[PDB]
Amino acid sequence: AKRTKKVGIVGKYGTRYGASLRKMVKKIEISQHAKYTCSFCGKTKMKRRAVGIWHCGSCMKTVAGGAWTYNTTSAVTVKSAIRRLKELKDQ
Amino acid sequence: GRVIRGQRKGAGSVFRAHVKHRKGAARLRAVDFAERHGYIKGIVKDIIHDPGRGAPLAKVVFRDPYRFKKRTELFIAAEGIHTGQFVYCGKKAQLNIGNVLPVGTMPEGTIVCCLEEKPGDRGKLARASGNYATVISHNPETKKTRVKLPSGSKKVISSANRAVVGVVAGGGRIDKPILKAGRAYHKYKAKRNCWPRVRGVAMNPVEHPFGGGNHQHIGKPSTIRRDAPAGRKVGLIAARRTGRLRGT
RNA sequence: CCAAGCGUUCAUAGCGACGUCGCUUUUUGAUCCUUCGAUGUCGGCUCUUCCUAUCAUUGUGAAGCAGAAUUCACCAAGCGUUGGAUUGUUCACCCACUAAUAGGGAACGUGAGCUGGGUUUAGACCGUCGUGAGACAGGUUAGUUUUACCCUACUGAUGAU
RNA sequence: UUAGUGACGCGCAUGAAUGGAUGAACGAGAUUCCCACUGUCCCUACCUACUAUCCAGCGAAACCACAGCCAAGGGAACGGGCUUGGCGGAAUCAGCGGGGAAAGAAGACCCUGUUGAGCUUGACUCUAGUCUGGCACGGUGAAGAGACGUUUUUUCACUGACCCGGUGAGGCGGGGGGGCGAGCCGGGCUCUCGCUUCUGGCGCCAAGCGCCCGGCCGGCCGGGCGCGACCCGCUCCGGGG
RNA sequence: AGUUCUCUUUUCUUUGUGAAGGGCAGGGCGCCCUGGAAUGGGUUCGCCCCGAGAGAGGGGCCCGUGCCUUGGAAAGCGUCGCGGUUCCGGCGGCGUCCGGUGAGCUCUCGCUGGCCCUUGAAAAUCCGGGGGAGAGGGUGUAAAUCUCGCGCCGGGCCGUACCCAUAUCCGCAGCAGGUCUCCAAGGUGAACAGCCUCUGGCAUGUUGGAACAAUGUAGGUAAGGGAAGUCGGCAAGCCGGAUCCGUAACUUCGGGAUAAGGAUUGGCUCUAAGGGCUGGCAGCCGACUUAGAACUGGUGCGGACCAGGGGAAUCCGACUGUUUAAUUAAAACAAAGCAUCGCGAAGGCCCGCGGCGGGUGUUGACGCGAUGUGAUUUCUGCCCAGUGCUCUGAAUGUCAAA
RNA sequence: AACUUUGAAGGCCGAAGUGGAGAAGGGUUCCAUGUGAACAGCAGUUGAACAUGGGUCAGUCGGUCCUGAGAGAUGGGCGAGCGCCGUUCCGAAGGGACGGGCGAUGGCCUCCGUUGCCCUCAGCCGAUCGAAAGGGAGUCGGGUUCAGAUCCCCGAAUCCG
RNA sequence: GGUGGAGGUCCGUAGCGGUCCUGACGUGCGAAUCGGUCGUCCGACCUGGGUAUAGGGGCGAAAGACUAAUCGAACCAUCU
Ligand SMILES: [Mg+2]
Ligand SMILES: [Mg+2]
Ligand SMILES: [Mg+2]
Ligand SMILES: [Mg+2]
Ligand SMILES: [Mg+2]
Ligand SMILES: [Mg+2]
Ligand SMILES: [Mg+2]
Ligand SMILES: [Mg+2]
Ligand SMILES: [Mg+2]
Ligand SMILES: [Mg+2]
Ligand SMILES: [Mg+2]
Ligand SMILES: [Mg+2]
Ligand SMILES: [Mg+2]
Ligand SMILES: [Mg+2]
Ligand SMILES: [Mg+2]
Ligand SMILES: [Mg+2]
Ligand SMILES: [Mg+2]
Ligand SMILES: [Mg+2]
Ligand SMILES: [Mg+2]
Ligand SMILES: [Mg+2]
Ligand SMILES: [Mg+2]
Ligand SMILES: [Mg+2]
Ligand SMILES: [Mg+2]
Ligand SMILES: [Mg+2]
Ligand SMILES: [Mg+2]
Ligand SMILES: [Mg+2]
Ligand SMILES: [Mg+2]
Ligand SMILES: [Mg+2]
Ligand SMILES: [Mg+2]
Ligand SMILES: [Mg+2]
Ligand SMILES: [Mg+2]
Ligand SMILES: [Mg+2]
Ligand SMILES: [Mg+2]
Ligand SMILES: [Mg+2]
Ligand SMILES: [Mg+2]
Ligand SMILES: [Mg+2]
Ligand SMILES: [Mg+2]
Ligand SMILES: [Mg+2]
Ligand SMILES: [Mg+2]
Ligand SMILES: [Mg+2]
Ligand SMILES: [Mg+2]
Ligand SMILES: [Mg+2]
Ligand SMILES: [Mg+2]
Ligand SMILES: [Mg+2]
Ligand SMILES: [Mg+2]
Ligand SMILES: [Mg+2]
Ligand SMILES: [Mg+2]
Ligand SMILES: [Mg+2]
Ligand SMILES: [Mg+2]
Ligand SMILES: [Mg+2]
Ligand SMILES: [Mg+2]
Ligand SMILES: [Mg+2]
Ligand SMILES: [Mg+2]
Ligand SMILES: [Mg+2]
Ligand SMILES: [Mg+2]
Ligand SMILES: [Mg+2]
Ligand SMILES: [Mg+2]
Ligand SMILES: [Mg+2]
Ligand SMILES: [Mg+2]
Ligand SMILES: [Mg+2]
Ligand SMILES: [Mg+2]
Ligand SMILES: [Zn+2]
């Protein structure tokens, strides 16, 4: 059955810290504990070892990722930007 | 009066950094012939957590060009690098995430991290998690480049300064509420003795300029001049303004 | 005390102006005589005693005392003078009963009798004041109550000439 | 019902991070009411244990001018003593808390002292630090502006004092030599490059070539030098100055 | 060995095997080989695993502290019985046996998971691998060589008793204080709770006897009333476990909540259900639970012990946390959150008599340094005259030395 | 002889003990015998008191070694100076090695050692100190004393050199 | 409807602490102790030893607290 109506994972904190902070941290708690698909092997095993460090239990490949998400929007934008400049550097 | 807490921090003692479990100093390679003329290859062996630092650290291994040895380097981990990846450092390295190049050869708009303040110093700027610097322009005649630092300041640096392409990993760390004095206790138990912080108004006049009074009030303007003696320079030090920053 | 008035009449049943003579030390003052090598500082509780300037009761006198009720005055302190809500309260106000619900003293009786609510240390908050440290017969909250086996007095207990 | 709660508000003297208003959960935080409960009380009684109590043994201390019954008087304005009265009878036991203005501690309150200390500041007099000008370390060359070949100043440069960073001070500067392109009528130059980018391997302690020398009987054994790995230089390499 | 008036094939005690070596159970493996899987399968309490090779077969390795064996029955122990100098490691008989069970407790090994803006030492020391400079003998009495099995010699120095705490330590003392650990039985019970008991320990806490006055200190009980007491329900008291039912306002939807409020609870005799091993059935094993019913007692049953009183509100602080050791535990402090301020390293902030000195800094603005406010929600109005702070300056009054 | 010892009763601590062992600290308090002067807040035939004598045995259990936070020399700097700062930072910081070459000596003189010099090769980059709970090879069973034993004896092992 | 087992989560022991009785005691057992009643009890938790900070100095989740029974400036000797 559905046990909570809205708190979800942040139900571990009971009534403490205020609704808005619990609401805000709920997005991170889900993301930082999710298992992401590993781009190197495909098994849904990529898990966070520490803040910024993401490890896959299948192929053992460790990746420097985001604090709470596997890759950040800023980092993904920079990779495309660095790709384009490289092409326009060597044509 | 007595010496105030801010004064006592500079004497070391119970205010020194907690470096027991740190993994070493995170630096670029020491610039040598290979990086001055071409490039050198290296392989990322591990990405490790460093206590007291938000960003992860990469453990890259190079071949010694003069001896039969392996050199282990402790880099700042640019976001997106993985173990087993090849990274290349030098003048002729290719513009890929994780490569170390002189900023002179980088085109305008390049995003870099762990950027040398001066040529050869092995990386000083934009090393905090998530941060980076951009390249604005080059002046080949004077051999100098213009970069934008994470604080927003623009600096003119030597073109020969090396730097890592990409942004430091572990970004967005400050987007999570701590939610707990205990969680903030653990954050600083790995850094230094700076927590918790006791307000000046909550002390006696003996140990703070703001202390004392039958009401908890500062009692004097909190903007203190830049030249105030140690033990008096508390509050808003040399503030150009105060209040809410409204607008740009 | 005098007596202009009041009391329908009528100064003096009962009151009493303008004036004036006293008493008391349960009010506050004034003073600074004793105590600063310390006389424990409010109130309550408990307990005894004393005063009378008498509320009640006994015996009386006078009324604008028909009766009832009441008022004034005498001898008079023997016996009483209570239960409660609010307040730290003294003081006050009301509820209820009562014959009546009088007023006081005893180092403003009584902290080696208690309590500690208030005042009156150190913590802390608010307001006003001060640049500030800080202050406020301004509010608020938390804040250690020591000793008797000596002498006397007293209560009882042996006893003594 | 001087309490509490809800309203009112010309509020002595409320009020917006000297934060205003709120509000779930939480509190050995302050307050009011109610149900229940009860010896808190009316109004006290009884019971148990350990004391107190008496005995054997053993055994201090605080405190003490002399002491120790009252009334009034006067008196340093509240006497245990003195005056006038009341009166007075050995030695003691258990209690008691009226008095000894009982003990305890040279009053913390208050005032005085030409006695302090903690703290503050718009007190007086200073002071570390700090900002700023001058002189010295302290040099070289160009110009610009001046003054009378010297000399003042501004700007731009220099490096060698001085400073900073890196390195196990490991290839710096200049030239030579070689490869890809350009181009004038096969050679010279404009001028660039110095052999590593697919893979989570390996990579040193010389191959080869040229020239000399030695030991043993042209053949076996054993060495040296050079190139390979360009040449010459004055600061290790950079950044400041 | 105890009990035996009656009963009890009863109750109590006791009923071994070290290190090291070998062998074997058992446990683990992210190790290999065959093979190729959807009608997807395997699988745990949960998970989790697979075309990057699942199921199914057959292997390999690691730990084996478990059992057997050498040790080793010769020793030890229980019991019975003999000697002696009788202060003998004295001598003999018999025995040291067979099974069951468990969310049990203690330890340990292993597997797998969660938490971190926390990622949880270093070095001595030991070992393997890559490489192949070298060395070894010329067919032998073979050589270099050997981390294999035996055999030979040695291991110096200092500590070591006992107390380890209501009497061996610190508080002036045999001081109701303080002072770091290890092992840890039966019953009841959720239980390392309380209450009783075995092993082991002790003698009531630096004295005894006789009384049973007052006043105490510590426990109880009280008719009728039920806070009238008091500054104040201080103190005491009521509630209390578990099962079943039931549960409001408000809420940040997590709570509030054991809300509040009821019923039940003993003893005894039964019934039903819940499993394992072997060969939709048969046989044999077994361990505690749950529910239901009858009967039963003077309505007494969580019978001792253990064990929340509750509700409606107001103020303050969000919370958990901290604090004046020895009169204040709080509304004070901290806090997450929020908002300012300085700083790009010849730097900010700070230390230092001193320097090519030092902390932040193994740091680099998502950082370090300095302040205010104090979760969330909602909002944070006007004032730059004052006092501060800050920015611009030869345009430019005053202005030291040189 | 209330208090010592033995025997028997009745009780308590009730495996988070009033049980059995340690660390720190104590330092002989441990054990046997004797005394009952003083001390053990009564007593004592008793004591942790006094007196006279004994008692602690190791390659294997600890220290010893390692490094930890840290402390601390030299070089250097500072300092009137005792000195201080500093710990890799302004340092010619290695006294070592397989192998090879020259001699000098020796002995199981055969041929192998040793030694001196030369050649060659050489990062560790920080003297030293820092834990009786961290790291750190290797000892277990039985017996034995008044008091010691994983230490003595018996038996069976093991590590290191 | 199950499974699962989070938490600066709740009752509660050890431990740590110390609210009220304004209890005991107050020439004490004690120059701060004792009883009941109480707070917390997976964490900002409790604790041993090692180590660092030294007196106008340290250290302070801030009480002018603590710094050897001494703290709004320790203790020791000297000036004296
Ligand atoms: Mg304060
Ligand atoms: Mg000040
Ligand atoms: Mg008339
Ligand atoms: Mg006079
Ligand atoms: Mg006096
Ligand atoms: Mg008196
Ligand atoms: Mg007195
Ligand atoms: Mg009269
Ligand atoms: Mg009085
Ligand atoms: Mg009195
Ligand atoms: Mg008193
Ligand atoms: Mg009071
Ligand atoms: Mg006060
Ligand atoms: Mg003001
Ligand atoms: Mg009332
Ligand atoms: Mg205000
Ligand atoms: Mg006696
Ligand atoms: Mg007298
Ligand atoms: Mg008296
Ligand atoms: Mg005086
Ligand atoms: Mg005085
Ligand atoms: Mg004078
Ligand atoms: Mg002064
Ligand atoms: Mg002073
Ligand atoms: Mg002045
Ligand atoms: Mg398979
Ligand atoms: Mg036998
Ligand atoms: Mg090999
Ligand atoms: Mg011993
Ligand atoms: Mg007793
Ligand atoms: Mg006794
Ligand atoms: Mg004792
Ligand atoms: Mg009653
Ligand atoms: Mg009754
Ligand atoms: Mg009342
Ligand atoms: Mg009353
Ligand atoms: Mg109560
Ligand atoms: Mg409620
Ligand atoms: Mg609070
Ligand atoms: Mg603290
Ligand atoms: Mg206190
Ligand atoms: Mg207290
Ligand atoms: Mg502010
Ligand atoms: Mg505003
Ligand atoms: Mg202004
Ligand atoms: Mg013991
Ligand atoms: Mg013992
Ligand atoms: Mg005696
Ligand atoms: Mg003895
Ligand atoms: Mg030194
Ligand atoms: Mg050592
Ligand atoms: Mg050790
Ligand atoms: Mg050890
Ligand atoms: Mg031996
Ligand atoms: Mg909790
Ligand atoms: Mg709790
Ligand atoms: Mg008391
Ligand atoms: Mg007493
Ligand atoms: Mg802490
Ligand atoms: Mg200092
Ligand atoms: Mg204060
Ligand atoms: Zn993967």
From Swiss-Prot, chain A:
Signal sequence extent: none
Entry annotated with the keyword Zinc: yes
Molecular function terms, GO-annotated: large ribosomal subunit rRNA binding; structural constituent of ribosome; zinc ion binding
GO terms under cellular component: cytosolic large ribosomal subunit
Annotated organism of origin: Oryctolagus cuniculus (Rabbit)
Main subcellular location: cytoplasm
InterPro entries in UniProt: Ribosomal_eL37/eL43, Ribosomal_eL43, Ribosomal_zn-bd
Chain's role: Component of the large ribosomal subunit. The ribosome is a large ribonucleoprotein complex responsible for the synthesis of proteins in the cell.
NCBIfam families xref list: eL43_euk_arch, PRK03976.1
Name of the featured protein: Large ribosomal subunit protein eL43
Family statement: Belongs to the eukaryotic ribosomal protein eL43 family.
UniProtKB/Swiss-Prot annotation, chain B:
Biological process according to GO: cytoplasmic translation
Chain positions covered by the region annotation Disordered: 206-231
Presence of the UniProt keyword Cytoplasm in the record: yes
Pfam annotation, one family: Ribosomal_L2_C
InterPro entries named in the record: NA-bd_OB-fold, Rib_uL2_dom2, Ribosomal_uL2, Ribosomal_uL2_arc_euk, Ribosomal_uL2_C, Ribosomal_uL2_CS, Ribosomal_uL2_dom3, Ribosomal_uL2_RNA-bd_dom
Location in chain, cross-link Glycyl lysine isopeptide (Lys-Gly) (interchain with G-Cter in SUMO2): 41, 148, 233
Modified residues ((3S)-3-hydroxyhistidine): 215
GO cellular component term of the entry, any: cytosolic large ribosomal subunit
Compartments it resides in: Cytoplasm
Modifications made to the protein after synthesis: Hydroxylated on His-215 by RIOX1. The modification is impaired by hypoxia.
Keywords: Cytoplasm, Hydroxylation, Isopeptide bond, Ribonucleoprotein, Ribosomal protein, RNA-binding, rRNA-binding, Ubl conjugation
Molecular-function GO term, any one: rRNA binding
Family: Belongs to the universal ribosomal protein uL2 family.
Purpose: Component of the large ribosomal subunit. The ribosome is a large ribonucleoprotein complex responsible for the synthesis of proteins in the cell.
Subunit comment: Component of the large ribosomal subunit. Interacts with CRY1.
Protein name: Large ribosomal subunit protein uL2
Species this chain originates from: Oryctolagus cuniculus
Organism lineage string: Eukaryota, Metazoa, Chordata, Craniata, Vertebrata
